[PDB]
Amino acid sequence: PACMERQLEAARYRSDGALLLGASSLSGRCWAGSLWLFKDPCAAPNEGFCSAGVQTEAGVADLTWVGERGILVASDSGAVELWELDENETLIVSKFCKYEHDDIVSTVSVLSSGTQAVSGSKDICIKVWDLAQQVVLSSYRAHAAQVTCVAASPHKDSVFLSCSEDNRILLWDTRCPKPASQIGPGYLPTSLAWHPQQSEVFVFGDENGTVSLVDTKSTSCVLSSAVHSQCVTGLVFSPHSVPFLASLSEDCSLAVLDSSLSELFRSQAHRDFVRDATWSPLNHSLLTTVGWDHQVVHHVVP
Amino acid sequence: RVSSGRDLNCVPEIADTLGAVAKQGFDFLCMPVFHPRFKREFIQEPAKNRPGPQTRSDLLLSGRDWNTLIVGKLSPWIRPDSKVEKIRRNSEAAMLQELNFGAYLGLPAFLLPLNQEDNTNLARVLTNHIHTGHHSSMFWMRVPLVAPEDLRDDIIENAPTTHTEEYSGEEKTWMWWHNFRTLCDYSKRIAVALEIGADLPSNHVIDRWLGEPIKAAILPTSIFLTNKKGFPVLSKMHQRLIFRLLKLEVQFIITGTNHHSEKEFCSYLQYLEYLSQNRPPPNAYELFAKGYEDYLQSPLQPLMDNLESQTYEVFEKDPIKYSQYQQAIYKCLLDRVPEEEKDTNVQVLMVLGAGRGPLVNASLRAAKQADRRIKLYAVEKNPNAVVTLENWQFEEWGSQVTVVSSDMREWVAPEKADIIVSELLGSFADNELSPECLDGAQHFLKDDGVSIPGEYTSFLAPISSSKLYNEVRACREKDRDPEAQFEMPYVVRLHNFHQLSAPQPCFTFSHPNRDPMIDNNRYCTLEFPVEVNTVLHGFAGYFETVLYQDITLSIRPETHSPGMFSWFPILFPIKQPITVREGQTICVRFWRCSNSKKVWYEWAVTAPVCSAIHNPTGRSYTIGL
Amino acid sequence: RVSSGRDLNCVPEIADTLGAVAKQGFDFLCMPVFHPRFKREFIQEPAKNRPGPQTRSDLLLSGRDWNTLIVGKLSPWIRPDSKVEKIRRNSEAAMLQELNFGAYLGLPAFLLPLNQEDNTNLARVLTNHIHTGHHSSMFWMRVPLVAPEDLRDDIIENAPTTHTEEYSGEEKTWMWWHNFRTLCDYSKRIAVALEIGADLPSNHVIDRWLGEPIKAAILPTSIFLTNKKGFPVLSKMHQRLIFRLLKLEVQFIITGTNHHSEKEFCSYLQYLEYLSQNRPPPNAYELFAKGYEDYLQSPLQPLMDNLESQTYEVFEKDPIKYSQYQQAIYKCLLDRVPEEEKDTNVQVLMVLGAGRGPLVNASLRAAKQADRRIKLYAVEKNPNAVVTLENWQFEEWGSQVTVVSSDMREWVAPEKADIIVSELLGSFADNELSPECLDGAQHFLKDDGVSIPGEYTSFLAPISSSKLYNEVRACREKDRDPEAQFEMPYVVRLHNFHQLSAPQPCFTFSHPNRDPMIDNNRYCTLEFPVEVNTVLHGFAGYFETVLYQDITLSIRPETHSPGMFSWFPILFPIKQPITVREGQTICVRFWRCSNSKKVWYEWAVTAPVCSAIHNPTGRSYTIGL
Ligand SMILES: CCN1CCN(CC(=O)[C@@H]2Cc3ccccc3CN2)C(=O)c2ccc(C(=O)N3CCC4(CC3)CC(OC)C4)cc21
Ligand SMILES: CCN1CCN(CC(=O)[C@@H]2Cc3ccccc3CN2)C(=O)c2ccc(C(=O)N3CCC4(CC3)CC(OC)C4)cc21
Ligand SMILES: C[S@@+](CC[C@H](N)C(=O)[O-])C[C@H]1O[C@@H](n2cnc3c(N)ncnc32)[C@H](O)[C@@H]1O
Ligand SMILES: C[S@@+](CC[C@H](N)C(=O)[O-])C[C@H]1O[C@@H](n2cnc3c(N)ncnc32)[C@H](O)[C@@H]1O
């Protein structure tokens, strides 16, 4: 807990109002990882005000909440590990660190129920976890290049998405004998996020700054906009009943998108890669962004 | 032992990690030099200005550790052939960065992937880096045997793979590498790192990748089976491949995570060492030839130079040629003189080209074997070796042996000869003026003499070889034709190549030539059915012989005489690669031209393409009479 | 130890004799290959037909003994320059015979005498033997320091020697060798075996024979004095000569009979070993430089290439340059800030060309020494080393140090500078764009700044050297001017040569150049009094410097800084030898030309002869800006 490493990777608001900073060191002598829990995320990222934090063996590519005290972390090494937050909200304890992948873990995400997990590593294979029993239930080598993202279905426990650098976008199901389902020669997709309300809409952001909105069973590119001039790193819908879509790219720019992909907000607050965002579980006008300029800039969105 | 190093993608502490691998027994380490997920933009602010540093300090290891242990990796995000213009330009800049930092650190090799067909910009950036500054990193262009898009499990319910016969659809990967290499112009600083997937391709393809400068085979820990005791082993065919590569002295790399959680990770490298120990022993020939693989040697001038004593000495340790010569002489002596005249009929040999004495000693041994009385001569052009023959003749041989100091073609013999043991066979069985020399020697061979050898043949087999082509290509010298290194035969222990077909008889010589019109000029048309997409970089030559009725000598690999190191093969290059498509027929032609003064061979390919008549008039390589 | 072998002329049994010498401790043996008194006629019968053999059989030793121990001798009777036509032709044939048999056996060197002036036919036969076949014998052309006709005792009552001053009459022998060598065209396979007669010549001459590729000094047992204990020792001056030769790593030969009959013969070689042990120890510099003697290295491109980490590391072990820099900065800081302001006045350095950090560490050390507060920058072009500087700056240096990643000539400085520690001095003190780079850096140096170095000078000294001339001559490459290897400076540890005169200042640079018109072009006329007949093969360059008022760095041999291996000399060749006669004055001219893009040096000799303007327009060697 000496100092939070220079590079922020992921940030996720907990339901109770706390912040979960993922931060790895991508430069310098030691390339190590470190999680961070803030009960007053405004005080971040000043380590002196962190209610919790811990080191790992290597870098944190993406992390997720599992329940209220769990933590899903994907090391650069290729092993997903589960860090049960201690009941005091003061210490972070490793539970397992299963060396399962053969190369960098690039995404993780929890199925809708909250009992299983999926990860995707530049070893093209995607896996599925059982967090209670702590082994892999299924190891599908579906794509043909690295897996760029995954997004678990908020409403169906057996549905998740995953785009690749081999231009495939696959809607998946844990039941079917053949689980993959290619659901669109364009620009390479780079991020996915299911719609929180109309559960059969999902949006893939491409490598050229064009947010899309594709229907699984229709596959007509419905509504897309070149909001960013560089790779769309992440998309995260808002908690409003009619939610907005946050759009942060390698350009160091963040915007909010509607159902018509009409720009609401555009912030250049970050002076390097904006790496992931989240909305306030308390103040729905309040958004938190974390980037590789080590800043955590709080945005008030219209 | 065979080198072997761990491929990593997680090195939090460089010193700790390298220490751990060294304890595990690895020799080197393949690591990323800039962090893998550290996407650095070189074009537009404000990302263009992320304050440094950029990577681990140069000083974390000493120049010696950097130079001898580590092997760099080109970051995954770098994609200099992506379609997006921005990503193309960013990747160009990043790849230049990473390669230059690798050369600065000193790394002894750099790992670059070939994971798609469109690799032209990558080849361009890499060649521009090969031509900037003086550095000695070598580039291992990781390329899998079977593409990812064909290794995948059939789980896409809506776009299943085309499982039907796709012959070259199974060879797409070698073509990927072939295009990359040809763009980068066969640079001797680009070499392959053949990934080994769980399922191998057919036999022909795995013959393909040999001849390709494979510098390291990359074995994932996903292909190691589990044995009943709980440790990894490799199936019989994987072991076959691994033994081939072991012959090729590659450096094996264990990439991937540990899949045997019961046992620590070193078991894999223990298994590689186990297999290397158990590999079938090298034979008598290969033992001698080691230290000689793919090393081109300019052939000998038979009549213009005098062989120096090291050469005679080293070629007098051959275990088979002299046994064969003794046996042949024994049989011929028995044949020519029956039992009853074994005391009245005296047979006069004349060893032509006696050297330092080995044929004459063998001839005397055979005369004693066959209980027949002989009167040897020994014609030996090299006046030095006439010195050694004189010493023998005075000391040991006695009046039994005469010694003549003159050319076989010019000497005037006192009395005619019955047998003539001569050994003037070259690498290619007639490219050392054995025909000419013996044709000038038969004027003193009786009307029923016997000439040993009585015949000898030459053999061609069209080989493909990147290593040997680039060898000939780097055989340039100042002060001569910029393209004559491709027009002369090279004596070489052909090792790293791919014989594309079966050798076929090229030029058959027999002795004596009592044909009324002696003509030593030869023309030959040969067709070699090529049955796999590949390139053709030259025609290799071998030879068989017939000393006496059945006693033979041969270096032709299918019937190679045992442990005969007196002759290596020959390599006739051709001026350019001839991309050949499977099922075609490579057609080649030789003329063995010779005039009053000189000799030479002229070779051309007349199908599927046509190549320049190589060595016309012996402008590149003529054997001086 | 230093090699040493017995010269013989009586070897009745080759094996016994070689065994005896090996027991005595010698390493090799110089023996005749054909018997000395065995006069062989090659022209007219019936002597043309003496039945063989001709010599000892090749087999009396193994190829290894022949190749490593023995050294042949050219029979005494052979005189290829006698006037008699018959003897000329016989000697031609015999010498060819003996040399070819020597090459056949494999001998590692062959001993040929120069005992008269007329050696033209000998040189011709020897060059024709050097150009026939592929062999690797090397030829030691035995030549005495003082001719026989001048070593003789004055006992001829009727024809006494001319004892008066005969200056070059004392140098006739070196001219003998010079003519032989020039005829044979400086062939790298002809080397001298300097006989050592009892009475040495003057100092200048024994400086002569160095620079001449002396490969073995031949000490007769007639020059060894007797000490009171009854064993041989050599006078003080003979010891001086023997120490010079020992430096030159020659192979000493003990020719002659044993003249100390009281003691066995090994005492002589024991004495040579004794002296070699007692020779004055090599200094700190020579210890580093060993393994580097007369080895030409193409200089660096300062601005076009990035120095690789091995280079920085190896040049960071220099024991003096960094001490000097620290001392200079200490003194300048004290000078610029008095005691009382030691806490209010903050001095800002800007190390230009920071490399991996050594100057900046030394600057911080000096600031602590002189108790003054400083704010360092570090301009470092090489982006790699910007990586190492970033690592230092984050880890240890802290905010005290800034790091800039850009050309000194292009960077836009935040605040002006007081001192600027820069180290861009080359082998020749201005041939690495220190003037240009600092002249572009002074726009941000205050009106009273201090630049370290404040000055630096270059120095020329005309050297003679057969070894180094033939080195440059064998520096040819394909694909360029057949005569551009003679137009570029070579960084080299000049070892085997003869500086013909004293170095004189060539180009004086001082900084900053607040002269209203900055001009870095230089013209210089130099006269070097040459006072001994010799040849001139190039102009060597050195340099001195003035870091601060009195602290200096220098590689100029007379004032060489101690143990400074950061710089070797430089060697400016010239296209041909310039035979120089004693008393003359060698006149040379340099222009330091530079245009908007590039820099280069143009050098010519305008007396006693005239040589082509070398490197006009930098067609051979231009330093890229
Ligand atoms: C120059 C490359 N060149 C020429 C020799 N020719 C051509 C040839 O026509 C010879 C000519 C000849 C001359 C005198 C007498 C007999 C023969 C027989 N035909 C070679 O083919 C050839 C063969 C082998 C080698 C070679 O590399 N080695 C020799 C064999 C060993 C390895 C090292 C094992 C042994 O270690 C104890 C030494 C090297 C070989
Ligand atoms: C290429 C021949 N070349 C070039 C280097 N330049 C030219 C030059 O301008 C350098 C440039 C420079 C660069 C970075 C930083 C400082 C400097 C200083 N000026 C040399 O002059 C030069 C000097 C020495 C050597 C050399 O052979 N060695 C280096 C010294 C040792 C012997 C081996 C002892 C030590 O063993 C521990 C290594 C080799 C030398
Ligand atoms: C290839 S070497 C081998 C000879 C010997 N039988 C041996 O086993 O080594 C042939 C020898 O024959 C001699 N020779 C070559 N050409 C000859 C010629 N035209 N006439 C007579 N002798 C010749 C040379 O001295 C050479 O050493
Ligand atoms: C001869 S090296 C020696 C530098 C360092 N002081 C040392 O002791 O090794 C000079 C260094 O200055 C840097 N350099 C060379 N030219 C430069 C320039 N024109 N502007 C800024 N830096 C330069 C190069 O990186 C080079 O490593």
Length of chain C counted residue by residue = 625
Total domain count, chain A: 1
In this structure, what are the phi and psi dihedrals at residue C559, rounded to the nearest 5 degrees?
Answer: -120, 25
Which residue is closest in CA terms to ligand 3's atom 27? B355
Place of tokens 């000496």: A2
Q: Which atom of ligand 3 is nearest to the CA of B315?
A: 9
Contact of C624 with chain B, judged by CB distance below 8 Å, is answered with no
The reply to whether C315 sits in an annotated binding site is: yes
Work out the minimum CA distance from A135 to partner chain B, whole angstroms: 13
CB C449 within 8 A of CB C380: no
Angstrom distance (rounded) from CA C255 to CA C250: 15
CB A12 within 8 A of CB A72: no
**Which sign, positive or negative, has the C-alpha torsion A120, B87, B129, B39?**
negative
| Bridge partners, residue C112, by sequence | C141
| Nearest one of B201, B284, B214 to B244, comparing CA atoms | B214
CB B303 within 8 A of CB B625: yes
The C-alpha torsion from B494 through B495 and B497 to B501, rounded to 10°, is 60
Residue C295 Cα to ligand 4 middle (Å) = 25
Q: Is residue B619 classed as helix, strand or coil in its secondary structure? A: coil
HEC string of B10-40 equals CCCCHHHHHHHHHHHCCCEEECCCCCCCCCC
| Nearest one of B164, B165, B120, B171 to B143, comparing CA atoms | B171
In this structure, what are the phi and psi dihedrals at residue C279, rounded to the nearest 5 degrees?
Answer: -60, 145
Structure-determination technique: cryo-EM
Q: How large is the greatest C-alpha to C-alpha distance in chain B, in angstroms?
A: 107
Please, which contacts does C555-559 make with residues 24 or more away whose CB atoms are closer than 8 Å? C555/C427, C556/C459, C556/C503, C557/C499, C558/C503
Q: Is residue A228 classed as helix, strand or coil in its secondary structure? A: coil
Q: What ranges make up the beta strands (E) of B378-433? A: 378-379, 417-421
Angstrom distance (rounded) from CA B612 to CA B616: 9
Q: Which atom of ligand 4 is nearest to the CA of C385?
A: 25
Q: Which bin fits B428, alpha (ψ -120 to 50), beta or left (φ > 0)? A: alpha
The reply to whether C312 sits in an annotated binding site is: yes
| Nearest one of B44, B33, B55 to B90, comparing CA atoms | B44
Class of the CATH domain delimited by B455-624: mainly beta
Residue B289 Cα to ligand 1 middle (Å) = 10
| Bridge partners, residue C554, by sequence | C544
Angstrom distance (rounded) from CA C180 to CA C119: 6
Question: Helix axis angle, B120-130 relative to B85-105, nearest 10°?
Answer: 30
Q: Is residue B399 classed as helix, strand or coil in its secondary structure? A: helix
Place of tokens 């005309």: C462
In this structure, what are the phi and psi dihedrals at residue A174, rounded to the nearest 5 degrees?
Answer: -80, -10
| Nearest one of B457, B462, B452 to B429, comparing CA atoms | B457
Work out the end-to-end distance of chain B between its first and last CA atoms, rounded to an integer number of angstroms: 48
Angstrom distance (rounded) from CA A200 to CA A193: 11
Q: What ranges make up the beta strands (E) of B430-584? A: 445-452, 455-464, 490-491, 498-499, 504-510, 522-529, 538-546, 570-573
Helices (H), C406-560: 434-439, 466-473
Angstrom distance (rounded) from CA B55 to CA C395: 13
Which residue is closest in CA terms to ligand 1's atom 6? B567
| Nearest one of A212, A178, A180, A173 to A193, comparing CA atoms | A212
Angstrom distance (rounded) from CA C511 to CA C449: 10
CB A58 within 8 A of CB B10: yes
User: Check: CATH 3.20.20.150 for B4-297?
Assistant: yes
HEC string of B83-101 equals CCHHHHHHHHHHHHHHHHH
CB C177 within 8 A of CB C209: no
Q: Is residue C379 classed as helix, strand or coil in its secondary structure? A: strand
Beta carbons within 10 angstroms of residue C144's beta carbon = 20
Sort out which chain C residues have CB atoms less than 8 A from A28's CB and list them.
391, 394
| Nearest one of B230, B224, B299, B205 to B269, comparing CA atoms | B224
Pairing of strands B490-491, B570-573: antiparallel
Structure tokens at A276: 């992931």
Which residue range is the domain that position A40 belongs to? Answer: 3-302
Write down the catalytic residue from C92, C432, C487, C544: C432
Beta carbons within 10 angstroms of residue A240's beta carbon = 12
**DSSP class of B396:** I
Angstrom distance (rounded) from CA C131 to CA C99: 12
Identify how many contiguous H helices and E strands chain C contains and give both numbers.
Answer: 16, 26
Angstrom distance (rounded) from CA B578 to CA A290: 57
Structure tokens at B619: 């402008």
Cα angle B157, B163, B169 (rounded to 5 degrees) comes to 120
CB B319 within 8 A of CB B563: yes
**DSSP class of B306:** P
CB B299 within 8 A of CB B489: yes
Angstrom distance (rounded) from CA B98 to CA B112: 11
Q: Is the Cβ atom of B292 under 6 angstroms away from ligand 1? A: yes
The reply to whether B423 sits in an annotated binding site is: yes
Contact of C402 with chain B, judged by CB distance below 8 Å, is answered with no
Domain ranges of chain C: 4-297, 309-452, 455-624
| Nearest one of C328, C385, C333 to C354, comparing CA atoms | C385
CB B12 within 8 A of CB A32: yes
**DSSP class of A188:** P
Angstrom distance (rounded) from CA C305 to CA C320: 26
Q: Is residue C168 classed as helix, strand or coil in its secondary structure? A: helix
| Bridge partners, residue A247, by sequence | A235, A255
| Bridge partners, residue B594, by sequence | B599
HEC string of B220-252 equals ECCCCEECCCCCEECCHHHHHHHHHHHHCCCCE
| Bridge partners, residue C7, by sequence | C30, C255
The C-alpha torsion from B546 through B550 and B554 to B557, rounded to 10°, is 140
Cβ within 8 Å, pair A181-B151 = no
DSSP character string of A115-162: SEEEEEESSS-EEEEETTTTEEEEEE---SS-B---EE-SS-TTEEEE
**DSSP class of B47:** G
Pairing of strands B445-452, B417-421: parallel
The C-alpha torsion from C410 through C411 and C417 to C421, rounded to 10°, is -80
Contact of C399 with chain B, judged by CB distance below 8 Å, is answered with no
CB B421 within 8 A of CB B449: no
Is C341 annotated in the active site?
A: no
Is B432 annotated in the active site?
A: yes
Structure tokens at B556: 């032709």
Structure tokens at C231: 């064993």
In this structure, what are the phi and psi dihedrals at residue B181, rounded to the nearest 5 degrees?
Answer: -65, -45
User: Which homologous superfamily does the CATH classification assign to the domain defined by B309-452?
Assistant: Vaccinia Virus protein VP39 (3.40.50.150)
Write down the catalytic residue from C98, C171, C195, C423: C423
Q: Which atom of ligand 3 is nearest to the CA of B432?
A: 1
Residue C13 CA from chain centroid, whole number: 42
Burial class, B357, CB count within 10 angstroms (exposed 0-12 / middle 13-18 / buried 19+) = buried
**Residue whose CB lies within 8 A of the most ligand 3 atoms, among B389, B420, B423, for a mutation test:** B423
Q: What is the CA radius of gyration of chain C?
A: 30
- Which residues touch B391 (CB under 8 Å, ≥6 apart)? C53, C56, C57, C58, C59
Angstrom distance (rounded) from CA B571 to CA B536: 12
HEC string of C392-419 equals HHHHHHHHHECCECCCCCCCCCCCCEEE
| Nearest one of A127, A180, A25 to B257, comparing CA atoms | A127
Structure tokens at B127: 């060649």
DSSP character string of C285-325: HHHHHTT-BT--B----TTTSPPPHHHHHHTT--SSHHHHH
Q: Is residue B430 classed as helix, strand or coil in its secondary structure? A: coil
Work out the end-to-end distance of chain C between its first and last CA atoms, rounded to an integer number of angstroms: 48
The reply to whether B321 sits in an annotated binding site is: yes
Q: What is the CA radius of gyration of chain B?
A: 30
State which amino acid sits at residue B418. Answer: D
Angstrom distance (rounded) from CA B507 to CA A129: 70
